[model samples]
Structure formats: C-alpha cells, structure tokens
Target chain A: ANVVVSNPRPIFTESRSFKAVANGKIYIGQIDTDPVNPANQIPVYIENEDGSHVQITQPLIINAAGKIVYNGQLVKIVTVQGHSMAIYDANGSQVDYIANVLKY
Target chain B: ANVVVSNPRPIFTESRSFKAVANGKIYIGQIDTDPVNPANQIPVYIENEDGSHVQITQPLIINAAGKIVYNGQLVKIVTVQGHSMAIYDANGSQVDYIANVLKY
Candidate 1:
C-alpha cells in the first residue's frame, strides 16, 4: 500500500543515519532516499580502523512489517528477564547482546 | 554527534512510515518524533489481520553506523552468487529469504 500523506503541505525532508558493530567490525548504515523504497533495503558499510569503509555486498533490509531481515529469517532483539537485550535467531538461539549503541 | 543542519533555515518536516511482516504477523513501523533521537530506536507494532495492532516489546533499532542490531550481533544480508536474498545469523547460518518487500 502507498503512504497517503495526510498533510499535503510541503514538509521538511531530512537525511538520517546510524552506526552498529558486530564481530569486532564497525558498520555504517543509512536511512536513505527514494520515497518509493524509503528505508527498505538499508545500505550498510564496514568501517575499517583506518577510516576507510567497505560496502557490504548485500544491504541490510527491513521488510514491510518492520522486522529486520538478513537474507530472510526474522532478526529479533530479545530482552532476557527484562535485564539486557540480545540478538536471537529464527531457531530461538541467542546470538549476541546489544552493546555500544550511539546515535549520530 | 548531532546532525548539523547547515541550512539553518526551517524546511518542512514530514512523517514517513512502513509495514513489514514476519512469522505470519504483520507489523507497522514508524519514523517518529524526538529530533535528538531521530530514527534510532524505531518503534514497531504487530498489525493483526483484523486491524488491531500490538506493540512489540523490543523496538527495532539501528546503531550510529546504520547496521540493525537485535542484541549486539551484526545482522548480515548475504547474497549467494547474487541470486536470491536470504537472512543469515551472525554464526553464518541461513535463517530465511527476502519475502514480500513493500514501502509506504
């Protein structure tokens, strides 16, 4: 379905971005342009210690339902006993705990 | 770091939204208010076929570098031979494939 902008009046459009790390590697991500595919397949890049970035062959993507999917299985952020948050796989296995979240 | 709006002049701010589905559950995601936070912790809700929506305990989030993280493990989108898209865990295990991708 298409987004029906209730307020037709011109509104400010801004570019938003963020950073995340995994497997000891830092990756850069974008909430890019393209109204038709807004924030759908989020493009990500691996940030090297030397200040260089290598774009990942496959861009991180979120399906229409808002869940992050890599490949196609549901990527879940599961909170254990209301204490800390961790990543979980489709088979309900823990992957990693969320750490060092900083918004740019 | 904060977004340095070089063009201090006020531009219009519009609201954009999207929907995604997982495990037969539909979810609605938002790019909400809070200029300081921006789209860091994206709020998501499960939209039932009957039209009711339930909020997920964990808000889908992206780090400053733009990679989506559930707990802390990096979500990777791997393309095998540049064919079909499938989800993979941090351990390099296949989860699922890219399903119906739509933007609103």
Candidate 2:
C-alpha cells in the first residue's frame, strides 16, 4: 500500500531581469541603454503555455522620460492605453496612452 | 396630377435658447446663469422620433471651463472620453471622458 497525493504549488514570480524557463520558455534582458544611442529598448513578449500563442519583440525604448529604472520589487507595471497607442514600462513609467493625447 | 417631390429637407437649425417643437419635442431655456446663484444649468435631452426613447434634464452646468457658450453656428460639440466615461458638449467642450483622467 503506497499512496501520496499532495498538491499545492502555484506562485511562480520572475521579472527582475526576466526568467521563466520551461512550460512556455521566457527570457528577457538588455533594457538600460543610451550610452550615445545604445539603441534603448525593452519590448519583449512570450506566451504559449495555453494562452494560444504570442511572441513579440521589438519597439521598446526608454532613454529618459523619467530616468528609467524597473524592479519595483520584481516588476509590476501594467498600463494599457488605447486610441492612438502609447506604451512604456522599462522603468520610464507610462505603460499605455493610445491617443487621448496629453501624454497619458 | 401634380408631382413635386423636391426631397431634401434636413436643414433645421435652432440653438439660441433651444427649440424643436414636434417630432421629438424639445425646448430649452435659461442657461446664462450668474444672477448671483441662478442655479447654473444646461442639462436637456429628447431623442425619440425614431431613435429609441430618452428624456433627461439635470446636470449640465458650464460656467468657466472655457467661458462656456454655444452656437458655433448651430451647436456642434462632441467629446467622448473612456475608461470611466466623461461627456460634455453644450459648449464647455469635452463631450466624453469616462475615465483615464486628465480632464478628457
């Protein structure tokens, strides 16, 4: 007689620099730039464990709108704007501003 | 046997003190406010004719948001904000601003 069914483990968190190995594969890096034009970037996406499928990586610049600096304990910035579209998160704050103008 | 269709009669302008008569029946007055505390109002509605039914009269105050005055010829101010919803059109402009703050 051998039986052991223990269940209860769901609290995965990662955002410091990015990391989510396996299950869906996620790895982000390089976001602080502007040493002259280091190509300031930050755009990164990946979701396909059951979220259907999504993978984007490109437009993401943060030079100095607020100095830029993430890791609010482990990233927790979520601002989605609409209308015209404006997104910033790599620390430059403002995560969304699609069109309403006046910034966000 | 006399036929004179002519068609085209969608030119009915009225917004001085407001007036609509039949069809939808509308008549608005008193909005210049400032007799010390004349109540300062502007709310007025009536959209029936064929478009569902609606008749409200309450909140509309507009004193100095921008001087507040209508008749850009015959009234034409449309602003619609989202997120929470903010609508103003009588003249003070900003016909919409549901949410997302920043006034609209």
Candidate 3:
C-alpha cells in the first residue's frame, strides 16, 4: 500500500534526516536506509551496543529534527553540522520535533 | 538545563500531544503528562499487551502529527475526531508528520 500522509505539510524534506520503522503490532527488530548515502536513520542495537544491529530497510524519513527529538529532552544535542547523524541521549525523547534545526 | 532547539520552529505546541523522554545515557523508564489529560503518547507495554504499561512522564508534545507518525506505515489511522486519541497500524511509521491531521 502507498505511504499514508495524514497531513499535507511533509514533516521533513530537508537534507538532514533520522528515520526508521516503528510499530505496535509486533516487536519490530529494526529497519533503515541505504549504505552509501544513508538517510538520517538510526540503527537500533539490541542487548549490547555492539556493532551488530537491525536492518531497517523500509521507510526513510527526512531528519528535519528527529535527531534532537529521539535524543530525548534531557539529552545534549551534539549536532555534527557536517553529517546527517546526530547523537541522542541515554534512551530517547518522548516528544518528537517538527522543524529541523541548523544550530548544533 | 534549557531545551536545545536546534531549529527555531518548535516541533509542536498544539492540543493533541504525545510525548515522553528518550535518551542514550541510560534506559530511561518512562515519563508523561497529566493522568487526566494524557498527551498523544504510546503506553509501551512490556511482555503482555495487557493494561499494565509505562508512565511516560516529563514532556507532553502537541499531538500535531505524532499519532500518524508513531502509527507506522502498515497500520490504519482511525482518528477519533471528538477526542485527542488516534489509532495506529501494524506497527508504526518511521516518518513523523509535520502537521496535525483532523481528517481521520
């Protein structure tokens, strides 16, 4: 089925991005973007923060502000202005952001 | 410490809200809004999908489009217009919405 766009304004269409598959139906392992030019996606690891992770290959959401968001509230936003990836905090932020920020 | 809004335009500030705390520091349990008026948050359950779930306190982001988002791609958006609750699908959408949808 086609992707659902509940609202008109796309959350993120910018260069920065952070996205992956999430669900309630099942305990979704993980999904992500391409290898070379990967989208702003996160590779969620299971037990240990080892190199092994899930393969989130489904959707690819633009990282407008997901980095700051997934980073949770208590997290310190360490934006690597150069790359698409940004470091999140301890666990995660419940609140997701709308617009992507440029300032680190 | 003050929230680090990398981008100026805040992610959300509406009535329909769903928020919690996430991080990379530690396995932050949960956080949420007032019990009376819960934000657009997902009460993550542990083993059984029974009534017992997390508290998810702390931030309460406006539901703007998080419902559609967290709902993933497979699930359906059964919007209960009268209230602030909306149903998601199979799992969830990796892409979060920027605007709040009113059209079920």
Candidate 4:
C-alpha cells in the first residue's frame, strides 16, 4: 500500500516565494528573501522500501539563478550572489564557493 | 552466535601511544603528543544489531588530566592543557572549547 504525506502547515501563509513541482514528486517550500530566495522550490522523489519509509531524493540549487551543475552522479548547482557563491548538492550539503567565505 | 573483529594494523609501532581496553570492547589509539597526549586512552562498547554493524558507544575525553564528563546520556570529557581545551563525544566529535580556537 502507498501513503501520501500532507504539508503539516500552509506554504504561502508560512512565507512568500515561488514553488516548483516535478511530475509525481513532492514539493517542499521555504520563505526567506535574499538574492538566494527561499520561495524557490525544489523537487523530491521517493523510492518505495519493503517495510520501512521510502528513500527521498531531492534536486537542490544554491543560487537558482545559475544553471544546474553536478558532482559525480549527484545533481548540484552553484549560485553566485552578492560577494559569494553557494553550491548545493543532492544531499543538501551547501558550500560557499568563495574562497575564505568562512574566514570573513 | 558472535564474531570478533581484528585491528587492521599494529597499535604501538604504528605510533607511540597508550592503549586502554575494556572487556569485550575495541581499542582505538592515536599518537600526537601535547599536554593532552594521544597516548591517553578511552573505552568503547558495542551493542549488537541483527544484520549490520553494531552501534558503538565510547567514553571519550579531550584532556586526560581532567575528569570524565557526561552530556545527556553520552559519556564525554573536557580537558584543558595549555592555551586551549578540547571536548570529545562518544561518537568521535572533538570540539576545542577555547573560544575562537579556529580563529588562531
């Protein structure tokens, strides 16, 4: 049997932003406004497991303004905003591409 | 039924350090010397899992000179030596408690 999950809360009422949905996938939203807008949406897909929760896969973008990039077999994107560029991986690890971003 | 796992390499010759072993537990060591010497030792325990690797629980300390401390249900220790102090968790996350240790 398959089960559907509902948004525990409202999206826009929670925050304002854009939403993107891929066919037969889940849409997760956020609402922080910056050059890196939180309204930007990401797509998530789940693979069924025998007796446990299905595995979830999501395509994340750091800047959303730049084109999608990939590392190894994983999908990734690097976005340059203001003084720094951020890179996000399929696994949700986000790294600032700017050298010494953590230093300053 | 049970199985024993062996160390892939020699302990002492690999480095100059102390080793502490508790009954039915694994001993891991390192060899850097400071007021908080790597020669100091800690104890670990493992809980059995049906099919995969067992969960590991270790009593870790940052400065061997100080007493062991516990955070929540996990055993941990903090040690102050020279300019800084370190804290180690059972899962091997070591945090240098000196404020802005990463800055220097």
lDDT digits (tens) for residues B33-103 of candidate 4: 12134344322222122322222333332222222222323222212221222333334333222222211
Better of 1 and 3 by DockQ: 1
Candidate 3 chain A weakest lDDT stretch, 10 residues: A21-30
State which docking tier applies to candidate 1: incorrect
Place model 3 in a CAPRI quality band. Answer: incorrect
Rank the models by TM-score, top first: 3, 4, 2, 1
- Chain A TM-score relative to the true structure, per candidate: 0.24, 0.19, 0.18, 0.19
Best by DockQ: 1
**Per-residue CA lDDT of candidate 3, range B1-104, in tens?**
56764532223211112221121010111122222233443232221134333232322222433331222221222222212222222233212222223322
- Runs in model 1 lying further than 4 Å from the true structure: A1-39, A58-104, B1-104
User: How well is each residue in B79-99 modelled by candidate 2, as lDDT tens digits?
Assistant: 221112223444433322212
List the candidate 3 regions with Cα displacement exceeding 4 Å.
A1-10, A14-55, A62-104, B1-6, B13-30, B33-104
- TM-score preference between candidates 1 and 2, better one: 2
The docking quality of candidate 4, as DockQ, is 0.01
Report residue B45 deviation for candidate 1 (angstroms).
Answer: 20
Give stretches of model 4 more than 4 Å off.
A1-85, A90-104, B1-58, B61-72, B82-104
Ranking by DockQ: 1, 3, 4, 2
Task: Give model 2's TM-score versus the native structure.
Answer: 0.18
C-alpha lDDT of candidate 1 relative to the true structure: 0.28
* Top of the candidates by TM-score: 3
Question: TM-scores, in order shown?
Answer: 0.17, 0.18, 0.19, 0.18
